[PDB]
Write a protein that binds this ligand. Structure first.
Ligand SMILES: NC(=[NH2+])NCCC[C@H](N)C(=O)O
Length: 690
């Protein structure tokens, strides 16, 4: 809706912008509201030291009649020299703030008291704090000279590239940027392009793109936009709820630039920005939180009003963007504290509602047509006796059974959040384990054996006539942490870091590289699809169990150069380790698998008990956590009346005229014994197709 032509005719005559009376103009426009003919004539001949006029400031609002505010400050002096205009605009926008009152700034993180609100990521999805800042000694963005914009870049980059620790990173200037860098920054949502029709008419687009640039730390949790709408747009953000950490990281960086360079700042306005809407703190603090039940709640609006925050909706059903509505009259510390307390109060509403509905027996389980293992063993008696206990990591019975409740068509419907779940909720888990893993009894206990030399497997089909492929997978979880459904944000990131650290140290047969899912370009994605190495987000069963939290943060893929060794990280289990080969050499596949699994084990360790073997969030993956597969062509021995008599002696099953043959048992036998059985069974099947 930009009409630059019409405005230019009024600007060149230094005449009152008549378009501000054209019915299409925004009724709520502040420049329309407060730029009266008497204001205009009183100021139309005034100019700042930098040459900024009244028309320069108001121009964007006349070009873009749909403007909410409609004015931009060319410099600091513009706020005072055109005071009769800016004051009325500021006190309208920032109501009930009064310029006479004064503003107080506070960038000391220690003043904020904010223990991590939602480490388990049950409700809060992401946290983001933005500040706008302008350097001492220069004009603001609409009025900065060509040389000054460059000098600002030079000084800012000098400070930013000296940043240490988690703030260390790289600067990417827009001028000279190549296509690969441009795409990387687009994929990370870090890029900004030429200003819209609002920045254009404000004169902010001058000399594009000279002096513009992007800085970001290696973690990609800190972002700086240089010379966009203001000199500095500084952003601290991350998934999860730790706003205390976010504000701490922001202030460490901001105060460093402050001490070395200095910001434009007054008592009246706080920190000076191009648009008056960004005065004071220059801050936008935001949190994304799934809060469906609290919205319905009668005290919802009162909490927002109390803490001066607002809620806007944006997969993300029930998810709201909570953010501050004030920038003047409160400090940065105060803005974050209201933000913290406000979210906390909102989260407590959502928690109360969920607690109430989780207080009673899942009535939906009373339907006789629900044939899940959950319904079979979860009597109201058992439910009542367990419903109020929680593990050391905050896992409850309802957390464990939630997927089976939400998904009535589950076969099992029960997941474990941590190791303690298998003991604390043993009345439920024991019966489910022994049912699915029948005839195994927990008292028998389980023996793990990852010694490949204890397997006697001379190659069956070296010709490659019958057995096309052989594949052995094991599911594993890293010791010292919760299981996948109960992982906190920092646990999942720790698991990725340490596992990646181990896999990179692998040599010989197992040397390879790691592809994280976060920030993966389309080229890598495609070539992983070709090899069938790429995994996607979990289904509705895993979603309801809490497995898909913060996707895809902390998820990644590793494979060796020979395409014979694959590791999925933080998918369904923390570690899904697969050995693959062409042909029939099971002993070679298992040997390679053992070499890698044993090394990861020594350096990191696995979650393991005598009664369950290796622990998984999914009770189906206990014991060996192993699926051994043989893709074999058997048209004839599939018919010999000794198929059952062999497929049952060696506990194997057949599907897939090529047939996939897999082990049926995971619990009660060792990995060695399981592999040996698959061998012994396929051998006799091959002693019939021979
Ligand atoms: N590969 C392993 N991490 N094995 C662990 C064996 C001991 C285990 N902590 C248990 O008592 O059951």
């Amino acid at each position: 809706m930009a009409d630059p032509e019409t405005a230019a005719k009024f600007k060149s005559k230094n005449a009152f912008p008549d378009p501000l009376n054209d019915p299409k103009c925004n009724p709520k426009s502040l420049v329309k509201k407060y730029l009266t003919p008497k204001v205009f004539e009183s100021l139309k001949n005034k100019k700042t030291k930098l040459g900024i006029t009244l028309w320069d400031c108001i121009n964007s609002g006349v070009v873009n009649l749909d403007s909410g505010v409609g004015v931009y400050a060319g410099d600091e002096e513009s706020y005072t020299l055109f005071g009769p205009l800016f004051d009325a605009i500021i006190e309208d926008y920032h109501s009930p703030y009064k310029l006479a009152t004064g503003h107080n700034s506070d960038m000391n993180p220690a003043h904020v008291k904010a223990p991590d609100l939602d480490p388990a990521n049950r409700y809060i999805r992401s946290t983001r704090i933005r500040v706008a800042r302008s350097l001492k000694g220069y004009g603001l963005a609409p009025g900065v000279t060509k040389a000054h914009r460059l000098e600002i870049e030079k000084k800012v980059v000098g400070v930013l590239t000296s940043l240490t620790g988690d703030l260390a990173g790289k600067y990417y200037p827009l001028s000279g940027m190549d296509e690969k860098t441009r795409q990387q920054l687009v994929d990370d949502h870090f890029l900004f392009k030429k200003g819209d029709r609002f920045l254009e008419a404000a004169g902010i687009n001058k000399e594009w793109p000279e002096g513009r640039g992007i800085y970001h730390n290696n973690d990609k949790t800190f972002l700086v936009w240089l010379n966009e709408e203001d000199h500095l747009r500084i952003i601290s953000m991350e998934k999860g709820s730790d706003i205390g950490s976010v504000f701490s990281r922001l202030c460490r960086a901001v105060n460093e630039i402050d001490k070395k360079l200095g910001f434009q700042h007054t008592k009246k306005h706080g920190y000076l920005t191009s648009c008056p809407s960004n005065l004071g703190t220059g801050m936008r603090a935001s949190v994304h939180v799934k809060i469906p039940h609290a919205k319905e709640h009668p005290d919802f609006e009162n909490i927002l009003t109390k803490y001066h925050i607002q809620a806007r909706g944006i997969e993300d059903a029930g998810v709201y963007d909570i953010s501050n509505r004030r920038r003047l009259g409160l400090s940065e510390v105060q803005c974050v504290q209201d933000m913290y307390d406000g979210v906390k109060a909102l989260m407590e509403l959502e928690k109360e509602a969920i607690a109430k509905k989780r207080s009673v027996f899942p009535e939906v389980l009373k339907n006789p047509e629900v044939k899940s293992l959950l319904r079979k063993y979860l009597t109201p008696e058992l439910f009542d006796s367990l419903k109020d206990k929680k593990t050391a990591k905050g896992i409850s019975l309802y957390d464990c059974i939630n997927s089976g409740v939400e998904n009535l068509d589950s076969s099992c419907g029960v997941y474990a959040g941590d190791e303690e779940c298998y003991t604390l909720f043993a009345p439920l888990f024991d019966k489910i384990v022994e049912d699915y893993h029948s005839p195994y009894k927990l008292a028998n206990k389980h023996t793990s054996d990852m010694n490949p030399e204890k397997v006697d497997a001379p190659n069956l089909d070296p010709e490659g006539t019958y057995i096309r492929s052989t594949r052995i997978r094991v599911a594993r979880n890293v010791k010292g942490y919760a299981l996948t459904p109960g992982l906190t944000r920092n646990e999942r990131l720790d698991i990725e870091r340490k596992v990646v650290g181990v896999l990179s140290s692998l040599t010989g047969d197992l040397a390879g590289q790691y592809y994280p899912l976060t920030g993966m370009d389309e080229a890598t994605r495609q070539k992983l699809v070709n090899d069938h190495f790429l995994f996607k987000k979990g289904d509705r069963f895993l979603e309801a169990a809490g497995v898909n939290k913060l996707w895809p943060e902390g998820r990644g893929i590793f494979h060796n150069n020979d395409k014979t060794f694959l590791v999925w990280i933080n998918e369904e289990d923390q570690l899904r380790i697969i050995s693959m080969e062409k042909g029939s050499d099971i002993g070679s596949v298992f040997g390679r698998l053992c070499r890698a699994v044993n090394e990861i084990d020594k350096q990191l360790g696995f979650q393991h008990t005598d009664a369950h073997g290796y622990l998984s969030g999914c009770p189906t993956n206990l014991g060996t956590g192993m699926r051994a597969s043989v893709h074999v062509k058997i048209p004839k021995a599939s018919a010999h009346p000794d198929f059952q008599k062999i497929c049952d002696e060696f506990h194997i099953q057949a599907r897939g005229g090529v047939f996939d043959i897999s082990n049926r048992r995971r619990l009660g036998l060792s990995e060695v014994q399981c592999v040996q059985d698959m061998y012994n069974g396929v051998k006799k099947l091959l002693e019939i197709e021979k």
